[PDB]
DNA sequence: CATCTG
DNA sequence: CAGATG
C-alpha cells in the first residue's frame, strides 16, 4: 500500500503506455497482473531477483524493478515521459469519444491538439465532437449543490410524465460524496420487467420531456434503455450559466432494479465485501439479482426484492445507509 | 454491455 | 458485420 508503491507504480505507467500507444495487450496485461501481485506483496521489494521470486513476475520485469531500485528512475519510462507522438495520444484520448484507437489514427495524421482537433471537426463523428465542444466542462467535477438542483429537476419531470417512474441517482452523489464527476439515473417502471417484452416508449418519453424543458441539451447515444446525454442547469439570471454535465439514464425492469440500485451506488469495495459474505450466507449477487447458492457446486433461481432492504435482509445483513456504503 | 460507425 | 467507446 506504500511500501512497494514506486513499483507498482511505474509498473502502471509502463502496463499503461503499451497498450494505449502500442498496441501491447499481451503487455500491457503483463504489468497489470505484475503491478498487483507486489501489491499484495507483504514484504519491502528490495530487488529483483527477490521480485522475480513471484508469479507474473518475470526477467523484464525485474530487470526495470532493479534499474528503478538501483537509480531514482526508469529510461524508458523517461524516454516515454517526453515523447511528443506519446504524449499525443494520452491527451487526444482526454475528449469524449476519442478513446487510444481514434488518438492514434489523428495523430498519424497529424491532429495532436484541440486546436489541430477544432480544424479538422470533419475527422470527427457526433459524440467526438459534442465532447470537444465541451472538453472543459466536461473534466470539471460536479459539485452536490448543483447535483441536488439536477436531480431536482429530473425527478419532478419523471413524475410528470409517469406517476408510476421510478428514478434514481446512483454514484457517489448517492453515498454522500460532494462533488461527482457526471449524473447517473436508473430507472424504472412496473410495466417494465424480465419477461415483459420491452416497452422502449419508457425510456424515450422522459427523454424527451428532459429536452422539452431543456435540462438535455444533446444527445451522445440514445437506444432503447441506455442514454448518454448533456444537460445543463437553467442559467437564472444571467451572469452565471452552468457548465454542461455529462449524463445518463437506462431503463430497467422492475424486477431488478434494487440490485442495479444498490450495486450502482457502490463503493466497489462496498459491494465486492457485500458480495463475499452474501456468498457466505449461502448466495450470490450481481448487478441484477440475488440468487439462492445450492450445493452440487452453484445453482440459481432469483430470490424476491422489492428494496435495498430485501436484499441485506437475505443475506441477513445490517441495512447499510447509503452514507456508510464506503469500503 | 449497449450503442454507433462505416 | 467487427470493432470502438463509454
Ligand atoms: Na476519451
Ligand atoms: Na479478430
Same mark, same amino acid.
Not at 512497494?4 to 500491457?28: C, P
Not at 440475488?290 to 437475505?314: C, H, M, N, Q, W
Given at each position: 500500500e506504500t511500501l512497494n508503491g514506486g513499483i507498482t507504480d511505474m509498473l502502471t505507467e509502463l502496463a499503461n503506455f503499451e497498450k494505449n500507444v502500442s498496441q501491447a495487450i499481451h503487455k500491457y496485461n503483463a504489468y497489470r497482473k505484475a503491478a498487483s501481485v507486489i501489491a499484495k506483496y507483504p514484504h519491502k521489494i528490495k530487488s529483483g531477483a527477490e521480485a522475480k /521470486?513471484?508469479?507474473?513476475?518475470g526477467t523484464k520485469i525485474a530487470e526495470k524493478i532493479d534499474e528503478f531500485l538501483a537509480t531514482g528512475k526508469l529510461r524508458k519510462l523517461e524516454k516515454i515521459r517526453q515523447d511528443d507522438t506519446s504524449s499525443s495520444i494520452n491527451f487526444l484520448t482526454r475528449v469524449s469519444g476519442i478513446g487510444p484507437s481514434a488518438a492514434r489514427k489523428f495523430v498519424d495524421e497529424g491532429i495532436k491538439t484541440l486546436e489541430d482537433l477544432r480544424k479538422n471537426e470533419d475527422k470527427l463523428n457526433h459524440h467526438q465532437r459534442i465532447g470537444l465542444k465541451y472538453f472543459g466542462d466536461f473534466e470539471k467535477r460536479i459539485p452536490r449543490e448543483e447535483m441536488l438542483q439536477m436531480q431536482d429537476i429530473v425527478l419532478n419531470e419523471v413524475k410528470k410524465v409517469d406517476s408510476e417512474y421510478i428514478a434514481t441517482v446512483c454514484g457517489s452523489f448517492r453515498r454522500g460524496a460532494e462533488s461527482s464527476g457526471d449524473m447517473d439515473v436508473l430507472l424504472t417502471h412496473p =410495466?417494465? &420487467? =424480465?419477461? =415483459? &417484452? /420491452?416497452?422502449?416508449k419508457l425510456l424515450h418519453q422522459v427523454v424527451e420531456q428532459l429536452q422539452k424543458v431543456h435540462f438535455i441539451t444533446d444527445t451522445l447515444s440514445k437506444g432503447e434503455t441506455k442514454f448518454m446525454g448533456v444537460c445543463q442547469l437553467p442559467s437564472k439570471n444571467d451572469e452565471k450559466e452552468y457548465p454542461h454535465r455529462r449524463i445518463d439514464i437506462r431503463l430497467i425492469p422492475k424486477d431488478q432494479y434494487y440490485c442495479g440500485v444498490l450495486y450502482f451506488t457502490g463503493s466497489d469495495i462496498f459491494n465486492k465485501n457485500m458480495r463475499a459474505h452474501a456468498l457466505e450466507k449461502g448466495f450470490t449477487i450481481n448487478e441484477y439479482t440475488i440468487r439462492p447458492l445450492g450445493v452440487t457446486g452453484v445453482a440459481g433461481e432469483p430470490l424476491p426484492v422489492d428494496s435495498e432492504k430485501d436484499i441485506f435482509d437475505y443475506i441477513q445483513w445490517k441495512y447499510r445507509e447509503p452514507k456508510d456504503r464506503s469500503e
Amino acid at each position: 500500500e506504500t511500501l512497494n508503491g514506486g513499483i507498482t507504480d511505474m509498473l502502471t505507467e509502463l502496463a499503461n503506455f503499451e497498450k494505449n500507444v502500442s498496441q501491447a495487450i499481451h503487455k500491457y496485461n503483463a504489468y497489470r497482473k505484475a503491478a498487483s501481485v507486489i501489491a499484495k506483496y507483504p514484504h519491502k521489494i528490495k530487488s529483483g531477483a527477490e521480485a522475480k /521470486k513471484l508469479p507474473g513476475v518475470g526477467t523484464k520485469i525485474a530487470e526495470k524493478i532493479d534499474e528503478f531500485l538501483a537509480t531514482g528512475k526508469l529510461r524508458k519510462l523517461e524516454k516515454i515521459r517526453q515523447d511528443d507522438t506519446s504524449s499525443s495520444i494520452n491527451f487526444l484520448t482526454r475528449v469524449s469519444g476519442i478513446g487510444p484507437s481514434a488518438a492514434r489514427k489523428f495523430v498519424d495524421e497529424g491532429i495532436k491538439t484541440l486546436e489541430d482537433l477544432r480544424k479538422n471537426e470533419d475527422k470527427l463523428n457526433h459524440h467526438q465532437r459534442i465532447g470537444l465542444k465541451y472538453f472543459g466542462d466536461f473534466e470539471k467535477r460536479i459539485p452536490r449543490e448543483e447535483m441536488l438542483q439536477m436531480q431536482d429537476i429530473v425527478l419532478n419531470e419523471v413524475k410528470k410524465v409517469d406517476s408510476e417512474y421510478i428514478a434514481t441517482v446512483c454514484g457517489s452523489f448517492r453515498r454522500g460524496a460532494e462533488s461527482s464527476g457526471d449524473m447517473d439515473v436508473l430507472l424504472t417502471h412496473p =410495466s417494465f &420487467t =424480465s419477461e =415483459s &417484452t /420491452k416497452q422502449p416508449k419508457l425510456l424515450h418519453q422522459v427523454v424527451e420531456q428532459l429536452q422539452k424543458v431543456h435540462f438535455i441539451t444533446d444527445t451522445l447515444s440514445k437506444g432503447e434503455t441506455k442514454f448518454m446525454g448533456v444537460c445543463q442547469l437553467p442559467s437564472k439570471n444571467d451572469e452565471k450559466e452552468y457548465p454542461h454535465r455529462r449524463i445518463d439514464i437506462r431503463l430497467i425492469p422492475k424486477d431488478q432494479y434494487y440490485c442495479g440500485v444498490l450495486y450502482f451506488t457502490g463503493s466497489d469495495i462496498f459491494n465486492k465485501n457485500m458480495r463475499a459474505h452474501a456468498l457466505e450466507k449461502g448466495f450470490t449477487i450481481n448487478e441484477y439479482t440475488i440468487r439462492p447458492l445450492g450445493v452440487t457446486g452453484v445453482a440459481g433461481e432469483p430470490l424476491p426484492v422489492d428494496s435495498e432492504k430485501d436484499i441485506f435482509d437475505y443475506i441477513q445483513w445490517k441495512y447499510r445507509e447509503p452514507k456508510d456504503r464506503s469500503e
